[PDB]
Amino acid sequence: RFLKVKNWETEVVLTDTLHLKSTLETGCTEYICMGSIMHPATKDQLFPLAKEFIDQYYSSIKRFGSKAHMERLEEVNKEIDTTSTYQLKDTELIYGAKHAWRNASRCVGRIQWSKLQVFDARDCTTAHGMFNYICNHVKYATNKGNLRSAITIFPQRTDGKHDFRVWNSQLIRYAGYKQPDGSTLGDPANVQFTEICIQQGWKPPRGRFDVLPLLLQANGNDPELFQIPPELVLEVPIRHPKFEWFKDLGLKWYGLPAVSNMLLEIGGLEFSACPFSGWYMGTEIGVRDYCDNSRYNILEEVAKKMNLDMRKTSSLWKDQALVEINIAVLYSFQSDKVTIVDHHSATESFIKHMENEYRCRGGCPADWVWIVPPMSGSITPVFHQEMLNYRLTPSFEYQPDPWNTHVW
Amino acid sequence: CPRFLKVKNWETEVVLTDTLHLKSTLETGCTEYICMGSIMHPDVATKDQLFPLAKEFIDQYYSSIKRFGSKAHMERLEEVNKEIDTTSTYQLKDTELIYGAKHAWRNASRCVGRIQWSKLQVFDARDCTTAHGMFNYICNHVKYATNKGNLRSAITIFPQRTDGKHDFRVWNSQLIRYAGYKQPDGSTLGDPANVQFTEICIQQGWKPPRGRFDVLPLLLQANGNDPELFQIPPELVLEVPIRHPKFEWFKDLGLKWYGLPAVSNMLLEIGGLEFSACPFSGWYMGTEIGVRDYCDNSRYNILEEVAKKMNLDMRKTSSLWKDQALVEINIAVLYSFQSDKVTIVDHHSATESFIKHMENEYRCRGGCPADWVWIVPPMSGSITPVFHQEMLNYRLTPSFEYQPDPWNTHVWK
Numbered sequence: 144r145f146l147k148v149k150n151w152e153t154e155v156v157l158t159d160t161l162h163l164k165s166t167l168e169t170g171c172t173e174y175i176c177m178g179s180i181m182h183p184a185t186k187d188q189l190f191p192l193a194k195e196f197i198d199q200y201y202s203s204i205k206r207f208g209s210k211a212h213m214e215r216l217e218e219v220n221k222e223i224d225t226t227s228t229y230q231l232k233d234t235e236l237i238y239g240a241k242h243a244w245r246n247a248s249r250c251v252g253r254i255q256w257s258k259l260q261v262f263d264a265r266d267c268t269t270a271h272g273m274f275n276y277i278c279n280h281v282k283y284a285t286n287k288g289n290l291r292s293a294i295t296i297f298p299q300r301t302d303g304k305h306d307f308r309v310w311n312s313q314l315i316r317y318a319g320y321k322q323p324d325g326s327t328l329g330d331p332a333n334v335q336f337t338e339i340c341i342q343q344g345w346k347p348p349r350g351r352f353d354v355l356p357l358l359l360q361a362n363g364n365d366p367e368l369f370q371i372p373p374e375l376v377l378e379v380p381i382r383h384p385k386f387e388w389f390k391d392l393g394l395k396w397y398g399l400p401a402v403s404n405m406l407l408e409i410g411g412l413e414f415s416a417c418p419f420s421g422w423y424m425g426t427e428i429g430v431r432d433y434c435d436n437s438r439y440n441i442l443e444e445v446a447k448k449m450n451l452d453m454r455k456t457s458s459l460w461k462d463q464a465l466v467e468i469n470i471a472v473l474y475s476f477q478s479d480k481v482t483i484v485d486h487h488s489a490t491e492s493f494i495k496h497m498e499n500e501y502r503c504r505g506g507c508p509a510d511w512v513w514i515v516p517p518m519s520g521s522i523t524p525v526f527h528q529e530m531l532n533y534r535l536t537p538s539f540e541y542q543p544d545p546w547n548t549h550v551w
Numbered sequence: 552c553p554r555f556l557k558v559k560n561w562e563t564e565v566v567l568t569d570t571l572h573l574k575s576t577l578e579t580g581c582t583e584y585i586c587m588g589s590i591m592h593p594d595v596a597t598k599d600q601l602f603p604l605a606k607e608f609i610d611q612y613y614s615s616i617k618r619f620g621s622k623a624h625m626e627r628l629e630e631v632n633k634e635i636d637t638t639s640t641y642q643l644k645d646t647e648l649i650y651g652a653k654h655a656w657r658n659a660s661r662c663v664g665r666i667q668w669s670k671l672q673v674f675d676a677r678d679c680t681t682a683h684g685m686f687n688y689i690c691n692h693v694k695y696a697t698n699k700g701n702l703r704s705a706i707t708i709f710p711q712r713t714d715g716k717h718d719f720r721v722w723n724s725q726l727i728r729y730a731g732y733k734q735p736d737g738s739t740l741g742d743p744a745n746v747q748f749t750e751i752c753i754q755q756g757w758k759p760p761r762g763r764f765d766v767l768p769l770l771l772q773a774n775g776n777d778p779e780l781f782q783i784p785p786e787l788v789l790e791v792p793i794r795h796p797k798f799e800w801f802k803d804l805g806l807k808w809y810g811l812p813a814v815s816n817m818l819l820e821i822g823g824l825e826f827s828a829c830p831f832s833g834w835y836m837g838t839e840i841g842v843r844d845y846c847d848n849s850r851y852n853i854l855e856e857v858a859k860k861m862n863l864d865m866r867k868t869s870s871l872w873k874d875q876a877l878v879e880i881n882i883a884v885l886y887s888f889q890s891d892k893v894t895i896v897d898h899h900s901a902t903e904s905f906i907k908h909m910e911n912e913y914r915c916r917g918g919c920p921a922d923w924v925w926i927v928p929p930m931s932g933s934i935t936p937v938f939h940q941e942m943l944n945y946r947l948t949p950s951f952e953y954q955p956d957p958w959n960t961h962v963w964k
């Protein structure tokens with residue numbers, strides 16, 4: 144039946160009806176909740192899924208059961224018969240991609256969901272083609288700093304043996320090197336991937352912030368390396384508005400956040416290669432990339448230059464350093480006219496977006512574990528917002544890392 | 552359901568295996584189709600409902616003491632059975648009551664302090680008959696737990712529920728709370744979240760000092776009777792004035808807090824028996840005060856006032872002036888508590904201890920139910936180790952449960 148979600152700051156209550164639409168499992172059961180777990184086709188399987196999606200589409204353009212709708216259902220039928228699959232209309236592709244964003248429970252940026260530039264790359268056949276398409280994506284989405292949401296969609300899966308995959312988990316990442324003395328240069332979370340690239344012929348400049356090459360797999364073939372031209376890769380020097388020594392830390396990050404390891408599911412079709420990009424929330428860099436112990440891990444270094452007493456944890460020296468790091472990140476991007484949102488503004492927008500979705504759509508799936516920012520949680524409004532999590536389709540899903548499932 | 556579930560720590564790659572979830576008893580609120588993991592809150596037991604619940608708990612008790620299947624075990628089973636058959640209920644032995652209380656804490660998915668679970672002082676108040684007697688028991692609890700600042704965790708357990716019309720209840724959600732007063736102009740004085748309860752007390756006869764930090768009276772209900780008001784002797788309420796190791800102006804904010812965190816509105820369930828009045832207390836994690844009591848918009852809301860005295864650019868939010876003020880506030884809370892030698896734990900220490908706790912529980916017990924949404928601190932989340940820890944949440948018994956607010960259910964005599 145109907146479910147209610149309360150905000151405990153405002154005492155506003157909303158009524159979720161939309162959840163009655165899902166089918167894919169959350170992973171939880173009545174007795175066990177896995178809300179903090181990160182990772183919890185044939186003709187007869189494929190058609191009902193297609194049927195539902197097509198029905199959903201024509202429902203959204205206000206003509207459910209139209210003549211257009213009828214032939215479409217017939218068209219899809221005969222096509223799954225004689226090819227064991229079907230191809231989406233251009234309008235259905237764009238719709239399905241916007242709604243996959245719209246249904247992404249873990250994304251705090253969804254107020255933007257309808258403003259999405261969709262690049263159809265379903266005529267791609269080679270890794271060289273893929274590279275070209277991704278280069279245009281990057282150039283378009285970056286837009287000299289005035290970032291624009293984009294997705295590039297490559298050919299759907301067919302037989303599992305001829306998959307398109309971007310092997311990079313993100314389009315822009317820094318390399319990670321495993322020093323002899325045991326330390327780590329660059330991004331320590333990328334050391335494996337970085338070494339796969341080296342093993343494939345990549346000449347590493349072995350520096351701290353080295354853009355990794357692209358590793359592209361087209362139609363199931365072995366993947367191939369490509370260097371993204373540097374002028375397409377926008378980067379930002381991180382400096383502080385008060386601490387003039389902060390630039391001396393030598394930090395930079397890239398402006399374009401672009402996830403390339405996920406799977407886009409529309410109407411039971413699987414787009415295994417679908418890089419999508421938006422713009423950053425400052426905490427992603429300031430908190431997670433920089434301060435995670437398993438990442439760049441700069442907190443102790445920064446605390447040094449801030450002259451903080453670091454003997455007891457109760458001095459909250461880590462907390463102080465963290466806030467200052469994130470100030471710099473926001474300031475730097477803003478100074479450089481590169482789009483960025485702070486976690487206060489982003490969460491505000493998200494509560495407004497939630498309100499919108501309950502109003503017009505009867506709910507909005509949201510993953511509180513992911514939505515609440517990794518710092519200053521309860522002084523952002525989403526902390527106090529009950530959210531319901533459920534899985535709506537079309538969707539972005541996780542998939543196996545390609546280097547675990549590829550015969551060469 | 553699967554016999555083995557794996558959880559991962561994404562910072563350390565450490566993987567743990569949970570078998571304890573199999574012993575889950577009641578429901579989470581989640582289904583396969585929806586997760587309620589961030590929802591805050593998702594006439595008595597019959598003879599036939601009580602039998603298996605009692606046996607379940609007794610079996611569990613004698614397993615813990617390495618006497619499962621012993622003569623004493625079977626005798627206790629038979630005795631409980633006869634008592635349920637003749638009296639429709641039964642009474643716990645003192646040993647069982649202590650075991651059950653310690654395990655309700657142990658099982659409390661939302662508590663980050665559970666490393667301490669086996670060190671809990673249990674006061675048996677099941678011989679209490681009147682509100683005055685409840686008051687005496689609660690005062691003793693407060694004095695014991697407070698221990699002049701060297702706090703000790705404790706629970707006081709009042710008589711179990713019988714027919715439902717004779718409940719013992721502490722009407723206060725917490726033993727020590729500050730009053731809130733709503734003004735004609737819509738401004739609030741004191742703790743704005745507490746205006747409803749404060750109005751109840753005033754109606755019941757309380758003479759309100761109308762100050763910013765007025766400790767509320769206890770409102771105590773014995774054996775189903777109308778509740779009665781009692782003032783906690785002020786000398787038993789230890790308080791800490793908040794000052795800052797660096798900013799000498801911080802003391803000029805006239806802030807202070809109470810030393811003892813004590814929850815009194817929850818229901819303790821042991822072996823199907825319901826203890827509707829079981830105030831328990833521990834000691835504070837700094838963020839509870841520094842972030843929530845002090846900086847929630849619906850609470851004391853001091854971020855603005857502190858920002859101003861810190862000379863912060865407050866036009867752009869991207870300056871993160873809220874964030875900077877929050878850290879300083881939580882620094883001052885920890886500094887004021889340590890200085891007055893009142894037990895407190897910072898959110899780094901607590902969450903690190905909880906990880907060690909959880910790992911030990913996986914090893915010895917086969918699991919450790921935890922509510923990530925509650926365990927992770929409300930500031931600086933990802934620089935505490937619990938943020939990166941996958942947790943399974945499930946409900947084991949004995950347990951602490953929520954219950955309706957008594958002013959919503961009480962039948963006034």
Ligand code: HEM
Nearest residue numbers: 244247249250251252255292294419420421422423424539
């Ligand atoms: C436009 C501005 C956007 C903002 C400010 C934003 C914000 C965020 C943030 C902060 C995260 C957390 C990422 C992490 O912790 O790894 C996230 C995740 C996510 N976003 Fe958005 N996002 C934006 C655009 C988009 C777009 C354009 C799409 C798809 C077309 C999208 C789909 C997703 C998905 C599927 C996740 C989950 C990632 C995962 O599971 O690893 N987002 N978003």
Ligand code: HEM
Nearest residue numbers: 656659661662663664667704705831832833834835836951
């Ligand atoms: C000994 C030191 C303790 C520490 C450091 C500690 C820490 C915490 C914290 C930080 C919370 C969250 C409170 C909130 O956000 O409102 C909490 C909740 C809780 N604690 Fe512990 N606690 C301690 C002792 C105890 C004891 C002695 C018991 C029971 C015997 C207990 C049972 C619970 C329960 C049931 C909750 C959930 C409260 C609710 O749902 O409102 N804790 N604890």
Ligand SMILES: CNCc1cccc(-c2cncc(CCc3cc(C)cc(N)n3)c2)c1
Nearest residue numbers: 313315400401402419420421422423424427
């Ligand atoms: C798993 N979440 C943390 C994590 C671990 C490892 C790498 C990343 C990561 C690295 N580079 C870029 C990203 C982009 C994340 C993102 C995606 C999108 C579409 C928008 C946005 N603001 N942020 C993530 C994140």
Ligand SMILES: CNCc1cccc(-c2cncc(CCc3cc(C)cc(N)n3)c2)c1
Nearest residue numbers: 725727812813814831832833834835836843
């Ligand atoms: C619901 N959590 C936020 C909240 C709202 C309203 C009141 C409170 C509250 C007021 N006074 C004291 C507390 C103490 C909670 C607690 C209990 C125990 C046993 C230990 C501890 N560290 N903290 C909470 C908390």
Ligand SMILES: C[C@H](O)[C@H](O)[C@H]1CNc2nc(N)[nH]c(=O)c2N1
Nearest residue numbers: 526527528529589590591924925
């Ligand atoms: C909506 C959300 O569940 C609610 O704000 C929760 C979040 N996590 C919490 N965690 C703790 N420790 N205490 C709380 O009161 C809350 N509130």
Ligand SMILES: C[C@H](O)[C@H](O)[C@H]1CNc2nc(N)[nH]c(=O)c2N1
Nearest residue numbers: 179180181512513938939940941
């Ligand atoms: C174990 C836990 O689920 C994990 O650390 C999650 C928590 N929330 C998160 N939230 C975001 N936005 N990104 C993350 O990587 C994570 N990690």
Ligand SMILES: [Zn+2]
Nearest residue numbers: 171176581586
């Ligand atoms: Zn769940």
